[PDB]
Design a binder for this molecule. Structure first.
Ligand SMILES: NC[C@@H]1O[C@H](O[C@H]2[C@@H](O)[C@H](O[C@@H]3[C@@H](O)[C@H](N)C[C@H](N)[C@H]3O[C@H]3O[C@H](CO)[C@@H](O)[C@H](O)[C@H]3N)O[C@@H]2CO)[C@H](N)[C@@H](O)[C@@H]1O
Ligand SMILES: NC[C@@H]1O[C@H](O[C@H]2[C@@H](O)[C@H](O[C@@H]3[C@@H](O)[C@H](N)C[C@H](N)[C@H]3O[C@H]3O[C@H](CO)[C@@H](O)[C@H](O)[C@H]3N)O[C@@H]2CO)[C@H](N)[C@@H](O)[C@@H]1O
Ligand SMILES: NC[C@@H]1O[C@H](O[C@H]2[C@@H](O)[C@H](O[C@@H]3[C@@H](O)[C@H](N)C[C@H](N)[C@H]3O[C@H]3O[C@H](CO)[C@@H](O)[C@H](O)[C@H]3N)O[C@@H]2CO)[C@H](N)[C@@H](O)[C@@H]1O
Ligand SMILES: NC[C@@H]1O[C@H](O[C@H]2[C@@H](O)[C@H](O[C@@H]3[C@@H](O)[C@H](N)C[C@H](N)[C@H]3O[C@H]3O[C@H](CO)[C@@H](O)[C@H](O)[C@H]3N)O[C@@H]2CO)[C@H](N)[C@@H](O)[C@@H]1O
Ligand SMILES: NC[C@@H]1O[C@H](O[C@H]2[C@@H](O)[C@H](O[C@@H]3[C@@H](O)[C@H](N)C[C@H](N)[C@H]3O[C@H]3O[C@H](CO)[C@@H](O)[C@H](O)[C@H]3N)O[C@@H]2CO)[C@H](N)[C@@H](O)[C@@H]1O
Ligand SMILES: [Mg+2]
Ligand SMILES: [Mg+2]
Ligand SMILES: [Mg+2]
Ligand SMILES: [Mg+2]
Ligand SMILES: [Mg+2]
Ligand SMILES: [Mg+2]
Ligand SMILES: [Mg+2]
Ligand SMILES: [Mg+2]
Ligand SMILES: [Mg+2]
Ligand SMILES: [Mg+2]
Ligand SMILES: [Mg+2]
Ligand SMILES: [Mg+2]
Ligand SMILES: [Mg+2]
Ligand SMILES: [Mg+2]
Ligand SMILES: [Mg+2]
Ligand SMILES: [Mg+2]
Ligand SMILES: [Mg+2]
Ligand SMILES: [Mg+2]
Ligand SMILES: [Mg+2]
Ligand SMILES: [Mg+2]
Ligand SMILES: [Mg+2]
Ligand SMILES: [Mg+2]
Ligand SMILES: [Mg+2]
Ligand SMILES: [Mg+2]
Ligand SMILES: [Mg+2]
Ligand SMILES: [Mg+2]
Ligand SMILES: [Mg+2]
Ligand SMILES: [Mg+2]
Ligand SMILES: [Mg+2]
Ligand SMILES: [Mg+2]
Ligand SMILES: [Mg+2]
Ligand SMILES: [Mg+2]
Ligand SMILES: [Mg+2]
Ligand SMILES: [Mg+2]
Ligand SMILES: [Mg+2]
Ligand SMILES: [Mg+2]
Ligand SMILES: [Mg+2]
Ligand SMILES: [Mg+2]
Ligand SMILES: [Mg+2]
Ligand SMILES: [Mg+2]
Ligand SMILES: [Mg+2]
Ligand SMILES: [Mg+2]
Ligand SMILES: [Mg+2]
Ligand SMILES: [Mg+2]
Ligand SMILES: [Mg+2]
Ligand SMILES: [Mg+2]
Ligand SMILES: [Mg+2]
Ligand SMILES: [Mg+2]
Ligand SMILES: [Mg+2]
Ligand SMILES: [Mg+2]
Ligand SMILES: [Mg+2]
Ligand SMILES: [Mg+2]
Ligand SMILES: [Mg+2]
Ligand SMILES: [Mg+2]
Ligand SMILES: [Mg+2]
Ligand SMILES: [Mg+2]
Ligand SMILES: [Mg+2]
Ligand SMILES: [Mg+2]
Ligand SMILES: [Mg+2]
Ligand SMILES: [Mg+2]
Ligand SMILES: [Mg+2]
Ligand SMILES: [Mg+2]
Ligand SMILES: [Mg+2]
Ligand SMILES: [Mg+2]
Ligand SMILES: [Mg+2]
Ligand SMILES: [Mg+2]
Ligand SMILES: [Mg+2]
Ligand SMILES: [Mg+2]
Ligand SMILES: [Mg+2]
Ligand SMILES: [Mg+2]
Ligand SMILES: [Mg+2]
Ligand SMILES: [Mg+2]
Ligand SMILES: [Mg+2]
Ligand SMILES: [Mg+2]
Ligand SMILES: [Mg+2]
Ligand SMILES: [Mg+2]
Ligand SMILES: [Mg+2]
Ligand SMILES: [Mg+2]
Ligand SMILES: [Mg+2]
Ligand SMILES: [Mg+2]
Ligand SMILES: [Mg+2]
Ligand SMILES: [Mg+2]
Ligand SMILES: [Mg+2]
Ligand SMILES: [Mg+2]
Ligand SMILES: [Mg+2]
Ligand SMILES: [Mg+2]
Ligand SMILES: [Mg+2]
Ligand SMILES: [Mg+2]
Ligand SMILES: [Mg+2]
Ligand SMILES: [Mg+2]
Ligand SMILES: [Mg+2]
Ligand SMILES: [Mg+2]
Ligand SMILES: [Mg+2]
Ligand SMILES: [Mg+2]
Ligand SMILES: [Mg+2]
Ligand SMILES: [Mg+2]
Ligand SMILES: [Mg+2]
Ligand SMILES: [Mg+2]
Ligand SMILES: [Mg+2]
Ligand SMILES: [Mg+2]
Ligand SMILES: [Mg+2]
Ligand SMILES: [Mg+2]
Ligand SMILES: [Mg+2]
Ligand SMILES: [Mg+2]
Ligand SMILES: [Mg+2]
Ligand SMILES: [Mg+2]
Ligand SMILES: [Mg+2]
Ligand SMILES: [Mg+2]
Ligand SMILES: [Mg+2]
Ligand SMILES: [Mg+2]
Ligand SMILES: [Mg+2]
Ligand SMILES: [Mg+2]
Ligand SMILES: [Mg+2]
Ligand SMILES: [Mg+2]
Ligand SMILES: [Mg+2]
Ligand SMILES: [Mg+2]
Ligand SMILES: [Mg+2]
Ligand SMILES: [Mg+2]
Ligand SMILES: [Mg+2]
Ligand SMILES: [Mg+2]
Lengths: 135, 218
RNA sequence: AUUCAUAAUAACUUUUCGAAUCGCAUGGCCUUGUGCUGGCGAUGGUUCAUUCAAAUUUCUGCCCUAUCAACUUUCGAUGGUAGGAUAGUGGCCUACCAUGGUUUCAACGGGUAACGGGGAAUAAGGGUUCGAUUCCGGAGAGGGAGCCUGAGAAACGGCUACCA
RNA sequence: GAAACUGCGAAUGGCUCAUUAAAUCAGUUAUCGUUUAUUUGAUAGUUCCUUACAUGGUAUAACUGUGGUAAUUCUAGA
RNA sequence: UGUACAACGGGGUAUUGUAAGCAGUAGAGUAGCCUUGUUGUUACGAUCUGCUGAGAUUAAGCCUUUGUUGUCUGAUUUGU
RNA sequence: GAAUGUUACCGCAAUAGUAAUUGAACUUAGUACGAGAGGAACAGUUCAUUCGGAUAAUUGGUUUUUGCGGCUGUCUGAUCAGGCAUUGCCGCGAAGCUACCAUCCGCUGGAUUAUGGCUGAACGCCUCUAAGUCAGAAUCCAUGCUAGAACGCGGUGAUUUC
RNA sequence: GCAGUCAAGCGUUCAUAGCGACAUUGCUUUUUGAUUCUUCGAUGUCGGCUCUUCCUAUCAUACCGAAGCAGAAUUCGGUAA
RNA sequence: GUGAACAGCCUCUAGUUGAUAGAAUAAUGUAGAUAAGGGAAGUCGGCAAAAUAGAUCCGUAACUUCGGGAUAAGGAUUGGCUCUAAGGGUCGAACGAUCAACUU
């Protein structure tokens, strides 16, 4: 069973007690007692009726439980592999110190560095394979 | 109802069928983002903690956190908001949305495990799934393996197999925002043409002033 | 024709643009570090002009009707000032102020089996009659209103509401 | 080279004559009263101030996977 | 003479809807008086705000009560 | 309510009164029956109708709770707090009372009627009938319900000292 | 006003399922007359409203019998106020 | 005093406080009130009762003996408080001094 709530006051409406109005636009209104409902019918304003809940929210009455406490956190997580890279496969590449990286560099860095000069005159070489090319 | 459980750590996902009456009601009148406790839901789940991330009521409508309320209200939905996919530019749409507060009308409850507990669920904390991609940028692979700006990346990136009939062809990303000569060449061309257009503009400016000097007198 | 272009000083600013952008090439230098410098392209970007447009706007011109003679001015009707709003002029709106504005040279009102025009039929001349319709302009997407995106919409083979 | 992202278009067309009698419209002016994607033509040495310039930072779609609804060019959450 | 009865008092419950009082750089404003102003003050001012879901009422046919104070042999009538 | 010793408690039950009515839906079943068109019922289920007896958790009504608030006019020098306007007026208003305007409850047998039958003579057959007997109604008598004879009754307790 | 008896006739056939001429025997007293016993030293005169109770010559409802009752509907009847 | 007012309501002066009294608070009355939803279905008939109501602005039909009909009909406003503006008397360019009112 479901406790509903007064559309005017903000009081808890237990089964039974109270009335249910259905406005012509189909918007539903529940009242916990003939008082609230009457106020509503008088077209009163729940923000201006002191004992209503909406009023004392709008006036910041009561409250202070939020000021009294603060709660947070409960988070963390670990890591998992990639298709194409197994965990240890990643644990091996993340691992190495920069000394292995420094050695890895110059071996390839100077590798194509010679392919740069072999290519540099290779256009000059295919420039000697065709220039004017008569007969 | 029907539970939907995520494991962020492993990446595993499995649905759960719990019909147990008084165990369900722990979820009830609790909103999205609130932490449950494990034992109340079932015996095995004891020791765990959940967080309710959403769901669909028995009519399918998605949950949206921030409405409060138990029930479906038709909302006017826009881009960069949940439960809506704006098929056209500037299009907004009135669409029904189930509330954040949990109630018995839900077909599936969405919750992720914030922390584990005593026992362990099969196919959930059992296995762990791979994330199918890896860093496609310069400083991503960099900060992935904890590298520098001179460490390059290249051979540090990921490769995948994909057998083709007999044997294979292995593939790998394009590493955008990589540092190449053509880029520095392009910056050269630019940083230059600035000045090349600068001086020549002041020249033809003074070159004109020769005219207006000798010009008139008339 | 200007309080125009453009320039000057004192400040102002949830400080606009001032290329972390792609494709083809691979050249030239010298202490040779993969240093330094370089080619035509593509996309952008600030203001200005241009173009494609848009918005308003001057003058003059509509059919039947007096068994329609007074009309406009609550609550904008006409004008003045200030402001606000707009892309901008303007009673476009607001505040204050004045009492203006149209009319027998036909207002105002009613009808239209009325979208306007280029044109069409008739073939002495002068005319009578017609134009939904190939072009131009206008309006609309069941009726109304509201709006998002956008350079451009009060859009409907867009959204939102109401009525049907 | 599918998808999806970013881009641009979707305000053109095509239709119809219901409104509309100084309204639209025509011929003729106005913008020294404004807006303008685009297109064409030009326009930029100046950015920090008292620590990347061999180029900062994250965020996400497609995708994969767990899903709800009788049902839609619906969508949730990982 | 009691685990009694009664009157008050207290707690609950309940109705109303925020008391008096004191205070406010809250109040449209108008008028004074002076050192004529970073707050320049003085008077009058519905109303607003704070203490205040406050104050008032609550068995008279509500519930309850370790408190206080009080009371507990008057009249008549009856015999197979 | 006098009196049948007094007083008190628990009971009996003569006699009288008596009470529940009716409808629909689903289902049976698109079945039976019919060429067709059509088109039932018993059993089962859910409700309803008129009636009756209570009852007030709820909802509504009622308001001298003159309980709280609010407003007019006048009066008490002002304040505070009040008086008067035959309850001044308005809003809410517990409690009580109350409503098919609210909720609950409304029994079980025996015996018969018409009628249909058994056995069966009269009348060697036949026949529900003459003797005998089976079934059978919104009926009767009870059960149940109300009152309890103030000249109907049972059990029981205690029965006088200024 | 209500109902009997005879049964020529009706009902395709067929008196009597349902009806029924000519006649004839009755009941009833919510009709109207006939009468003038009661009341003219006074019995309040229409209708309605309200409420109770009785009648049965049954409109419904319970259980039935009959049909010119296939079903459905209807009609006639019994016990029934 | 409130108000248009000798209205109704409260009051000063003045006069009264006189109309058998005590206890209760059944039914039925007499008089005074209020009712959910429906809204004259009640009844000979809306009998009774209820609704309307002051004032300001607005708008006000047929018919007509042109005087009416007319408050026709139909609408809006209404407290409190703090301010503004306009409406005067007398006295010796239009002033000066000076006294006073309430109303819009
Ligand atoms: N129900 C009146 C109608 O009048 C219509 O037309 C009428 C008039 O418009 C027309 O002209 C009349 C004229 O007859 C009469 N004797 C003199 C009068 N001035 C004219 O009147 C006409 O013209 C004048 C200008 O001259 C306008 O001001 C006036 O409004 C217009 N009605 O003559 C007709 C009367 O004879 C048609 N006859 C017809 O539709 C019908 O009769
Ligand atoms: N409730 C259903 C409907 O109402 C009634 O249904 C009733 C019948 O089914 C049955 O009621 C029977 C009745 O059939 C029978 N012919 C008469 C009997 N008196 C009734 O019985 C009733 O009264 C008796 C006491 O007489 C009580 O014991 C019994 O509990 C009571 N239900 O019980 C129902 C409720 O009493 C109507 N008969 C009918 O409209 C329809 O079935
Ligand atoms: N049948 C006994 C049970 O009570 C109910 O049945 C009650 C009634 O429905 C049932 O009614 C029967 C009726 O079916 C049967 N054919 C005839 C019987 N006389 C009726 O019973 C009723 O009849 C009248 C009614 O005023 C009373 O005189 C009689 O005492 C009464 N029992 O009589 C029962 C009461 O005794 C239900 N059928 C059910 O709860 C159960 O079967
Ligand atoms: N209405 C749905 C059903 O149809 C039924 O059907 C009945 C009706 O079609 C028809 O009944 C008629 C009725 O129409 C008419 N208005 C009244 C007439 N006395 C009834 O007659 C019937 O019922 C009565 C009483 O039960 C019996 O005595 C009679 O023999 C019988 N033919 O005959 C059926 C009963 O024999 C009932 N109306 C109803 O109870 C049932 O639920
Ligand atoms: N003219 C109104 C004035 O104020 C009062 O009158 C007002 C109230 O007394 C009167 O109230 C009546 C009530 O008496 C009568 N017996 C019942 C009626 N329903 C009420 O009236 C009100 O009822 C409801 C709101 O409650 C509304 O539906 C209805 O429109 C409204 N008039 O409504 C009147 C307003 O229409 C005084 N009687 C008197 O001062 C004067 O009549
Ligand atoms: Mg109440
Ligand atoms: Mg997000
Ligand atoms: Mg790139
Ligand atoms: Mg000269
Ligand atoms: Mg300038
Ligand atoms: Mg270009
Ligand atoms: Mg004028
Ligand atoms: Mg308007
Ligand atoms: Mg102006
Ligand atoms: Mg201006
Ligand atoms: Mg403007
Ligand atoms: Mg004028
Ligand atoms: Mg037309
Ligand atoms: Mg035309
Ligand atoms: Mg045309
Ligand atoms: Mg011609
Ligand atoms: Mg000609
Ligand atoms: Mg001719
Ligand atoms: Mg046409
Ligand atoms: Mg035409
Ligand atoms: Mg066209
Ligand atoms: Mg159409
Ligand atoms: Mg954009
Ligand atoms: Mg359009
Ligand atoms: Mg279009
Ligand atoms: Mg549109
Ligand atoms: Mg279309
Ligand atoms: Mg077009
Ligand atoms: Mg017109
Ligand atoms: Mg033109
Ligand atoms: Mg971020
Ligand atoms: Mg997301
Ligand atoms: Mg007490
Ligand atoms: Mg207590
Ligand atoms: Mg106070
Ligand atoms: Mg002080
Ligand atoms: Mg102060
Ligand atoms: Mg001050
Ligand atoms: Mg001030
Ligand atoms: Mg000052
Ligand atoms: Mg308070
Ligand atoms: Mg005490
Ligand atoms: Mg004696
Ligand atoms: Mg004895
Ligand atoms: Mg006694
Ligand atoms: Mg007894
Ligand atoms: Mg069926
Ligand atoms: Mg059918
Ligand atoms: Mg068949
Ligand atoms: Mg047949
Ligand atoms: Mg068959
Ligand atoms: Mg049945
Ligand atoms: Mg049955
Ligand atoms: Mg009762
Ligand atoms: Mg009262
Ligand atoms: Mg005093
Ligand atoms: Mg008073
Ligand atoms: Mg007095
Ligand atoms: Mg009075
Ligand atoms: Mg008096
Ligand atoms: Mg009083
Ligand atoms: Mg009340
Ligand atoms: Mg009550
Ligand atoms: Mg019953
Ligand atoms: Mg019942
Ligand atoms: Mg009983
Ligand atoms: Mg019994
Ligand atoms: Mg029996
Ligand atoms: Mg035999
Ligand atoms: Mg027999
Ligand atoms: Mg016998
Ligand atoms: Mg015999
Ligand atoms: Mg027998
Ligand atoms: Mg019975
Ligand atoms: Mg007794
Ligand atoms: Mg006795
Ligand atoms: Mg007797
Ligand atoms: Mg005796
Ligand atoms: Mg004895
Ligand atoms: Mg008779
Ligand atoms: Mg014959
Ligand atoms: Mg025959
Ligand atoms: Mg007669
Ligand atoms: Mg006589
Ligand atoms: Mg006589
Ligand atoms: Mg006599
Ligand atoms: Mg007489
Ligand atoms: Mg007499
Ligand atoms: Mg008499
Ligand atoms: Mg008399
Ligand atoms: Mg008579
Ligand atoms: Mg009989
Ligand atoms: Mg019968
Ligand atoms: Mg009848
Ligand atoms: Mg036959
Ligand atoms: Mg029939
Ligand atoms: Mg019938
Ligand atoms: Mg008959
Ligand atoms: Mg009877
Ligand atoms: Mg006065
Ligand atoms: Mg007076
Ligand atoms: Mg007297
Ligand atoms: Mg008395
Ligand atoms: Mg009385
Ligand atoms: Mg009375
Ligand atoms: Mg009242
Ligand atoms: Mg009523
Ligand atoms: Mg009412
Ligand atoms: Mg009405
Ligand atoms: Mg009437
Ligand atoms: Mg009538
Ligand atoms: Mg009549
Ligand atoms: Mg009257
Ligand atoms: Mg009254
Ligand atoms: Mg007037
Ligand atoms: Mg006239
Ligand atoms: Mg009037
Ligand atoms: Mg009249
Ligand atoms: Mg006011
Ligand atoms: Mg003055």
């Amino acid at each position: 069973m479901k406790v509903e709530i007064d559309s005017f006051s903000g009081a808890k409406i237990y089964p039974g007690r109270g009335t249910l109005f259905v406005r012509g636009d189909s918007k539903i209104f529940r009242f916990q007692n003939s008082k609230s409902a009457s106020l509503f019918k008088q077209r009163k304003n729940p923000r201006r009726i002191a004992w209503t809940v909406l009023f004392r929210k709008h006036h910041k009455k009561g409250i202070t439980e939020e000021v009294a406490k603060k709660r947070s956190r409960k988070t963390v997580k670990a890591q998992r592999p990639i298709t194409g890279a197994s965990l240890d496969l990643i644990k091996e590449r993340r691992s190495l110190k920069p000394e292995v990286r420094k050695a890895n560099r110059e071996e390839k860095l100077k590798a194509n560095k010679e392919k740069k000069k072999a290519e540099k005159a290779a256009r000059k070489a295919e420039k000697a394979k065709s220039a004017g090319t008569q007969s | 109802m029907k539970l939907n459980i995520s494991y962020p750590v492993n990446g595993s996902q499995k649905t759960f069928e719990i019909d147990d009456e008084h165990r369900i009601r722990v979820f009830f009148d609790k909103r999205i983002g609130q932490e449950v406790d494990g034992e109340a839901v079932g015996d095995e789940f004891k020791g765990y903690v959940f967080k309710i991330s959403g769901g669909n009521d028995k009519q399918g409508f998605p949950m949206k956190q921030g409405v409060l309320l138990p029930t479906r209200i038709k909302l006017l939905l826009t881009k960069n908001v949940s439960c809506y996919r704006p098929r056209r530019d500037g299009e907004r749409k009135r669409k029904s949305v189930r509330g954040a507060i949990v109630g018995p009308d839900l077909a599936v409850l969405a919750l992720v495990i914030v922390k584990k507990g005593e026992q362990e669920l099969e196919g959930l904390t059992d296995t762990t799934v791979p994330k199918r991609l890896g860093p496609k940028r310069a400083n991503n692979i960099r900060k992935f393996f904890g590298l520098s700006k001179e460490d390059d990346v290249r051979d540090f990136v990921i490769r995948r197999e994909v057998t083709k009939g007999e044997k294979t062809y292995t593939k790998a990303p394009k590493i955008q925002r990589l540092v190449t000569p053509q880029r520095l060449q392009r910056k050269r061309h630019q940083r230059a043409l600035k000045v090349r257009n600068a001086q020549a503009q002041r020249e033809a400016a003074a070159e004109y002033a020769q005219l207006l000097a000798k010009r008139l007198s008339e």
